[model samples]
Target: GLIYAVGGYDGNTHLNSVEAYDPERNEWSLVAPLSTRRSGVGVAVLNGLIYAVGGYDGNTHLNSVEAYDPERNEWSLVAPLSTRRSGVGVAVLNGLIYAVGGYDGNTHLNSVEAYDPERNEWSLVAPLSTRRSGVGVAVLNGLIYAVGGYDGNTHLNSVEAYDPERNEWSLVAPLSTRRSGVGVAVLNGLIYAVGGYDGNTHLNSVEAYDPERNEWSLVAPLSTRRSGVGVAVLNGLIYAVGGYDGNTHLNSVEAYDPERNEWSLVAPLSTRRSGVGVAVL
Candidate 1:
């Protein structure tokens, strides 16, 4: 299996560079860079391609969307979003991509949109109940879950789940700790949320949610406190990668074993970054 690390900020500048890690070889190789520089971009893989959505391009909030073709080692522009956004949450389900809450330059956003790849178009979807940015989103059991994020006034712990069947979002159990820039992933039927910032400081805490119980339980925390981390599940292990750790950008990596309820250091990245995106293939 291969894990892809996409665009992010490196303290000095917004980055468009991309890299892929091969667990078999335990190494990383550079891939095609994005057409535009960006950080806080949301990434999702579908139909054998990688989609990089709305994000901050250093100067302006971006509405631009791009798709990367791994086979061709190239990037191409796709349909742009209806509104410029930064720190958006994205997920793919039933062949469609959903872009959730984010900052739209002037204000936090509650709006959501859906993209139909086959049609090459984007359409509006029901908005979130509360405006948020820098949220963690994941798809589990056919539903989309949007977790902790900044809601303008404060960091949020509120959680919401979207049901496509009903075309609406409903409140679910909140995270135990209020945070933003968290990394989330679904593993063995449970949703796991990793390191993020809590207004005052970066956090090392982690939590997991069980839909059947409609509850969240604190789990193993990372060894290093971080925000803007990237997470993905592969080979039954949840890998949490680079982020800002308050003092500096991080290249450290950790892996969690759900059965053991623990996190252990893994191979670190070659470069330090924050707001990076990850996808496993």
Candidate 2:
């Protein structure tokens, strides 16, 4: 029951073209062009609007944020972020938009910033405990979890949680594998971390975190080993889209069924790319 996915890179270049996928129709239709073309971006639906945030344009990093209105198929630029960064992670908590760690041109960053949608402004928040890029972010049990990513020099297994109320971060369970460029989502009360690279190899491995137990366990492996994959949960199923296998960019999509512990191929993407970002209606 997946619906649509947006923006990513085709390996050689960044993409501004948006694509919408319909499972029932078994088709993908190109949507309106994005305001900017970039890879390693983050997308999230907050209060009925689709927000697309920071990523790398060919020659420079971006801090710009854009919102798309599905009903009108139009995009409007929003206030730019405080930091010009790529490989960033974003999540919404208690109506506030939180943007986490990413790569600035010279180094990996731990800087955290929040946006007040009502005021249309951004303000600094407590920095991430560990500086990183390509992080996977999720909000569960009223806490923001920043998962595995690269720290400029190495792949990291670190996982940190931010308590918005306290304006602080605390170390949580590390990911089962050292990786970056991961896709993460919460479903049925469990946090699922999916496809990414572990430095030496692209990974198809999937892991789940149980916050109540504060532990992690391996789940089903992805149908394709990749990095920069797009992930989303729709109608209780997890859908993973376009990513790279080191050798090539891919347009393939796969769905995970927890009840059966299996992955099934879905419709292939219309464009071959990695660093994809997805949001569901």
Best by TM-score: 1
TM-score of each: 0.98, 0.97
Tens digit of per-residue lDDT, candidate 1, span 86-176: 8998999999999999898999999999999998888999999999899999999999999999989999999999999999999999999
On lDDT, the candidate that comes out on top is: 1
**Candidate 2, poorest ten consecutive residues by summed lDDT:** 1-10
Model 1 misplacement above 4 A: none
In model 2, the runs with Cα more than 4 Å from the true position are: none
lDDT of 1: 0.90
Query: After TM-score superposition, what is the CA distance of residue 210 in candidate 1 from its true location, in Å?
Result: 0.6
Instruction: Give candidate 2's error at residue 200 in angstroms.
Output: 0.9
In model 1, pairs of residues that clash are none
lDDT of 2 by residue, 6-107 (tens): 678886778887888887776788888788996888888888788888888777888999988888998889988999768888888999888899987888
